[PDB]
């Protein structure tokens, strides 16, 4: 029935490049339904053959955030994004 979709876990193809650079500028603040909130220095994204997840470098340890469709991620003077814009 349907072959084309547009359901992204968090970050999209292009929207991920502009959001992470302009909206996150390396340092992003991740938040969860449990009112979680944490900023992370440096970050890039990786797209799986099936979907797409973000991968941020935590000082000296690689971390993967947004791969679980995190409720929302906010950035000072930018905004809050929940499991992909929708």
Swiss-Prot record:
GO terms for biological process: regulation of termination of DNA-templated transcription; transcription antitermination. InterPro entries: ROF (IPR009778), Rof-like_sf (IPR038626), Rof/RNase_P-like (IPR023534). It comes from the Bacteria. Suppresses temperature-sensitive mutations in essential genes by modulating rho-dependent transcription termination. This is Protein rof. It comes from Escherichia coli (strain K12).
